[PDB]
Design a protein around this ligand. Structure first.
Ligand SMILES: COc1cc(Cl)c(O)c([C@@H]2O[C@H](CO)[C@@H](O)[C@H](O)[C@H]2O)c1
Ligand SMILES: COc1cc(Cl)c(O)c([C@@H]2O[C@H](CO)[C@@H](O)[C@H](O)[C@H]2O)c1
Lengths: 810, 810
């Protein structure tokens, strides 16, 4: 049908059809008479998977023969979403499969909806790892993603009575056609035990052993015939485990629990033993695999020349003392040489400045679980602090501030400090964030080793986040400027010469309208909710968090409702306000915010006076596959975190690429987005980081705002009195109390500017031609935010490898 | 190479080779450079599996269109062993695959050894179910095996310091290429809860739900293109299960533990709740599946015409009250009609008379776990006892004897009584056993309903137990009488006309010698043990049990050793005494017997005076795949249970078919074996059932035998004094005490006759020509013991269906 989806040649379509029928028969053991849509999905998935394997085998053979420097991306999260369409896109198979399935009497889009998301992440950090894998393969890097194969990913969110309910994400129930179990490459991982000191060094003995079994998933590059590997470890008990008889077999579950479930916290540290085990499990198995592959090419001098390890936040920070452990205890290298190798090998990416999100592990936990690692950490600390003392003599407070060991009621290890000490590069994820790191939490470290600190602004892959989810837009762009932009997103700048092109303006607006119609139909079919497709689609989708200020959005929504009720017969630009995202199960305030949103909808959506001028919808079970649907349909992107709190954001970039305008604070990547597009083409409001600091020094008093803004007072009175909860008048008392007395994120402080900025949004939307021209100016300048750019910077500035756009032979 | 292994045509070999290479590439994602022997096994398994699927789909389509009466074989055990060679045999693919693999530069026998046993059984009962599935498919019956997919089958036995050690049988670690998961046919199973009585009947409410997920394994008939199904259920927690968050996900293990592990007890009842859950789980899921298939053909009058349910012992006895529950509570049939349907549908096979092996479930367990089933059982009992009272008025003791409810300190349900009451047929597994049932434990029931009681003598499949494991013998037989005997074993009678044929005599003896050489080489390669291949191979392989009297064998072994030590320079027929089998982990005496056997070997095998005239070897990890190796190599089969204790035995039949002579008591199927071959061609010794009864009435005094037999006294003194355990002189005190004071199985009573009979064995072995002629007379009369005969009898006399040897179109 459309150009960017590739060729549907007679030869290919015929071959795809027969292999589909072969898989249906031999693989699924079904015939067309008993086959269900799910069977048809799996037949297609297996058929598409077949096209990967040849390229997969020859890619890994190529790396063996050429022996390039290998990049190991260590992450506790890989938020992959669905794989079928992505594989078709990257292999140029989409139109051929569409044709083949059509001729078999099947609708491919219907089959695509059957695939479960691989929801092995919480939000931005997990999704970044996924975009990164895509970009590294597209840039021809010898890269491996290493993580955990969670049996249960991020929970499925149900909304019941307006409340979030969690259910297990049993994503493997029907099987995963993409993965290949590699039980032959199973590795032992050690826990507990004790340290013995011998004549010939330290020994870690009397340990409990858990097996790490790898599962490999192919990661195709965009039409370059490169297929890299994501290797995810699964925990297995050894066969002599606890070996009355029956209970001993049943107790195998204890060991295998390590890989059972993803901790469902976004940007929040939960110091539980099981989480620590997960973190060591991935690190220990990965490092053995790395060293094995390195030896199969004695001389560890060349280790950093052949290996780079990227730590996705501090979650895999134990890689540092584990590498030291292996090099010192097992390979018998002296400390100094081992340390040199470790530092040159490891690099660390920080994703947050929120105190509650930073990993600080109780010493007593590490003492029991990983006794040798604690000793190594202590030794690292001593030697590091000796360097600090030499550089800043007599500065005793600096010594306590920089220590990896934090003193107090419970002694803790600051994992970020460990990461900085043991890495040759430390980066933030957006320019403002990286600057904040150097000025605040890592200031001391920056002063000691300024060369270590870098910025690498985040990005998103234009394959998934444009071509896949928005083929209509990708096509109208390709009609003008060709297909090259898909792997060179900077080329979208060429679209600036079309900002006054009446044909292009109409087409851009047409694509949006179609996307909005498709999504409006999705909502009625799957959730029985009615929306006006001509309204402004005002969307905030992201994890529920106080810092992300879904509450500020709520206040605006209520303001709009109150203004309508005050002047019913006055014209207002119609809006559909969509808010979605999951709350961590233990995060009470976030769960309350979800209830507030649904409660507002319950009043707003049923008020006859409002009509269809205002609708408030909570988007249930927000996840990668839902993002791919809602983002192309959005007109307005809400990126309204308190300045200085959102390290980057990546959802913001997805909306920009897909033709939404952005209302946002100057926070994270928003700053660079506005810079690229021009501030005139962005809806910027609110305090800057400097203004937040000024308010903190003075003392934030929320009552002041309540006293001076009558519209804000009305809302708070409504919340308190039970306007949005008539049967439970005090339901939102916790929310009001927080807003009035202990709001860390200054919701009230940005309220006035937010509401005024929103008025300017509605004004522009009244002029469809000028709205669309601003949209074009956004899409045209979104190039910087391709993860291809991000990965190229990591490659050149951290990993010391050169990206390659060259095809491998097919 | 050999005729019975089928044709290796150019067309087939070429196609097999390319499909092997296809699977290696696409399925395993390997090339020849990195592939291991295990990879080669899986490529072959997948290639052979491909040949099943077409036949599998069309068989099940055939049953849908023809709608025959369906046979449901319910068992908690299916002791399947390896599947690859069996599939090749039944599909006539063996020579073709042998050729194809040879041309690829691979040895197929080497690849065959890589497959894990499906060890989902303990011994004879589990292996009978497996032989039965093979025969039902070969006889064209619409049969389904239903069981549990245990994650861990029978434990792997290691011998350490002469002691049995258990390790988990992680048979699914590398995957199972034979099974097809069918998550779409998942069914709910209910536990706990309570019974509510409404206006419209009883309701079982507030239950805990466990999901039953089926896995289907194909069961090919012998060259008839029939492929039946073994459906095994796996336990899955529902997604809202226990839905802090993390613990709730981790607690899913509780529900999934149902299908985790096989209870490793042979012929012994362990009344644990988890076992009861397993028994209900299989029954509940199976019955829903049965009824669903029956409806998809309202009128349950025709249910028994379209459905037969065979209960493999009392393990699935809950099928009876479960069927009643469904028919009465859910389908709203009146009691009497539902009962009529149930009785006509169900039939029960008993496999034991040992009191400790009979299932008697505490009422309090059933009360909590299955409250509605207990009520139904009580109602069944009341109505049954009313019939007894009417038939035998005033016989109050009969009423208490026949009750399904046993009174005492703990009230129990006698599951055998439940089975008899609710089945139209009750059978034992050998003529003597079935007679014992009518005369002893089920006497009262036989008097009330004589028509119910039948015999069905056990059998073994001649495919696995001759063609597969002994191709050399199958071939020399086929050379004389053709190939028809493989599915018509009675044809082996034709071999009686070859008993004086000098060529045949030489060939029979040659095949045995080759089998013995192959097994002697297996022992050195895998276990580093040295044996004399010219010695008499004296073997007892079966589960370790007091009733099977491995101890009597031990006494004979020590007798031989003592006699050699007394007269060293006297000639004795050299023997290799092989004993193997697993002890249930909680069975102390059985574990002690294993230690005794190894202890005897430790002395005997290292005494220079003995030389290679006597060797005692404990065969480690006895299992189906090992049986296939040792049985063809045996000269003498030890079948020496106390008369009246071994219901049938099936190992006995395997040895007979494979050219071993039998030393045995007149117990179980031994009686019919001796009857078929002629008592002159069997080594029968010891008490008959009647002699055991006489000794019981008089009182068994072991001291009497000790006092009157000096050779026996010497052995007991040796055991007591620490001759076989110098470092722990009192090690075998428990064994001696049992033998002397509380031996339920009268080991001493059969000692003299056993030793004398063994002398006659050695005498015959000295004359190789007459040994072999007796062997021929055994093989020639083994026809009755084909499971094809057994299944044909079940079909005609119980299930009311006619067997068919007709091919389905290929
Ligand atoms: C430990 O710090 C974390 C943890 C998690 Cl799970 C996470 O999603 C992020 C997010 O990581 C994303 C990727 O860098 C950023 O865009 C967001 O600003 C940031 O909040 C940061
Ligand atoms: C509950 O009674 C049982 C239980 C188990 Cl696990 C078993 O293997 C047997 C054996 O079942 C075999 C098959 O009928 C017979 O040949 C043997 O004589 C018998 O001991 C009987």
């Amino acid at each position: 049908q459309i150009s960017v989806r590739g060729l549907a040649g007679v030869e290919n379509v015929t071959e795809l059809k027969k292999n589909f029928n072969r898989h249906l028969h031999f693989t699924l053991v079904k015939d067309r008479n008993v086959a269900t849509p799910r069977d048809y999905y799996f037949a297609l998935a297996h058929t598409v998977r077949d096209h990967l394997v040849g390229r997969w085998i020859r890619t890994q053979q190529h790396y063996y023969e050429k022996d390039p420097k290998r990049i190991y991306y260590l992450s506790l999260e890989f938020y992959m979403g669905r794989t079928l369409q992505n594989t078709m896109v990257n292999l140029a198979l989409e139109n051929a499969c569409d044709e083949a399935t059509y001729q078999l009497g099947l609708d491919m889009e219907e089959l695509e909806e059957i695939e479960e998301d691989a929801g092995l992440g919480n939000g931005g950090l997990g999704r970044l790892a996924a975009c990164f894998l895509d970009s590294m393969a597209t840039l021809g890097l010898a890269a491996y993603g290493y993580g955990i194969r969670y049996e249960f990913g991020i929970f499925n969110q149900k909304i019941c009575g307006g409340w979030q309910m969690e259910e297990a994400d049993d994503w493997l129930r029907y099987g995963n056609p993409w993965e290949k179990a590699r039980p032959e490459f199973t590795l032992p991982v050690h826990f507990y035990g004790r340290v013995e000191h011998t004549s010939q060094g330290a020994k870690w003995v009397d340990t409990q052993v858990v097996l790490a079994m790898p599962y490999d998933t192919p990661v195709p590059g965009y039409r370059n015939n490169v297929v890299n590997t994501m290797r995810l470890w699964s925990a297995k008990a050894p066969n002599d485990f606890n070996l009355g008889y029956i209970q001993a077999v049943l107790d195998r579950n204890l060991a295998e629990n390590i890989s059972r479930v993803l901790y469902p916290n976004d940007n929040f540290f939960e110091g539980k033993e099981l989480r620590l085990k997960q973190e060591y499990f991935v690190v220990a198995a990965t490092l053995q695999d790395i060293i094995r592959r390195f030896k199969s090419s004695t001389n560890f001098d060349a280790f950093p020349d052949k290996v780079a390890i990227q730590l996705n936040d501090t979650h895999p920070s134990l890689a540092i003392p584990e590498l030291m452990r292996v090099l010192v205890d097992l390979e018998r290298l002296d400390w100094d040489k081992a340390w040199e190798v470790t530092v040159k090998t490891c690099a660390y990416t920080n994703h947050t400045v929120l105190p509650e999100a930073l990993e600080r592990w109780p010493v007593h936990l590490l003492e029991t679980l990983l006794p040798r690692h604690l000793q190594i950490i202590y030794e690292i600390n001593q030697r590091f602090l000796n360097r600090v003392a030499a550089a800043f003599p007599g500065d005793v407070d600096r010594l306590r501030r920089m220590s990896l060991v934090e003193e107090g009621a419970v002694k803790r290890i600051n994992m970020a400090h460990l990461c900085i000490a043991g890495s040759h590069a430390v980066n933030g994820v957006a320019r403002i964030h990286s600057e904040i790191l150097k000025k605040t939490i890592f200031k001391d470290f920056y002063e000691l080793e300024p060369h270590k600190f870098q910025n690498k602004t985040n990005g998103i892959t234009p394959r998934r986040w444009l071509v896949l989810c928005n083929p209509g837009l990708a096509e109208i762009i390709a009609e003008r400027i060709g297909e090259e932009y898909i792997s060179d997103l900077d080329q979208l700048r060429k679209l600036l010469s079309y900002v006054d092109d009446e044909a292009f303006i109409r087409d851009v607006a047409k694509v949006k309208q179609e996307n909005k119609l498709k999504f409006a139909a999705y909502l009625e079919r799957e959730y029985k909710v009615h929306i006006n497709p001509n309204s402004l689609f005002d969307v905030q989708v992201k994890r529920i968090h106080e810092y992300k200020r879904q509450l500020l959005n709520c206040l605006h929504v209520i303001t709009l409702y109150n203004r309508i009720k005050k002047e019913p017969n006055k014209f207002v630009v119609p809006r559909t306000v969509m808010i979605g995202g999951k709350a961590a199960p233990g995060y009470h305030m976030a769960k309350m915010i979800i209830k507030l949103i649904t409660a507002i909808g319950d009043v707003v959506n049923h008020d006859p006076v409002v009509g269809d001028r205002l609708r408030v919808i909570f988007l249930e079970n927000y996840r990668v596959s839902l993002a791919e649907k809602v983002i192309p349909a959005a007109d307005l992107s809400e990126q309204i975190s308190t300045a200085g709190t959102e390290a980057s954001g990546t959802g913001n970039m997805k909306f920009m690429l897909n033709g939404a305008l952005t209302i946002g604070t100057m926070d994270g990547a928003n700053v660079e987005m506005a810079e690229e597009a021009g501030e005139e083409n962005f809806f910027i409001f609110g305090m800057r980081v400097e203004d937040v600091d000024r308010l903190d020094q003075r003392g934030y008093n929320a009552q002041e705002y309540y006293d001076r803004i009558p519209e804000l007072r009305q809302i708070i009175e409504q919340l308190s009195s039970g306007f949005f909860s008539p049967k439970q008048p005090d339901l939102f008392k916790d929310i009001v109390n927080m807003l009035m007395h202990h709001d860390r994120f200054k919701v009230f402080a940005d309220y006035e500017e937010y509401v005024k900025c929103q008025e300017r949004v509605s004004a522009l939307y009244k002029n469809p031609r000028e709205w669309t021209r601003m949209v074009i100016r956004n899409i045209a300048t979104s190039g910087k935010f391709s993860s291809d750019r991000t990965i190229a910077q990591y490659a050149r500035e951290i990993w010391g490898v050169e990206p390659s756009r060259q095809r491998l032979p097919a």
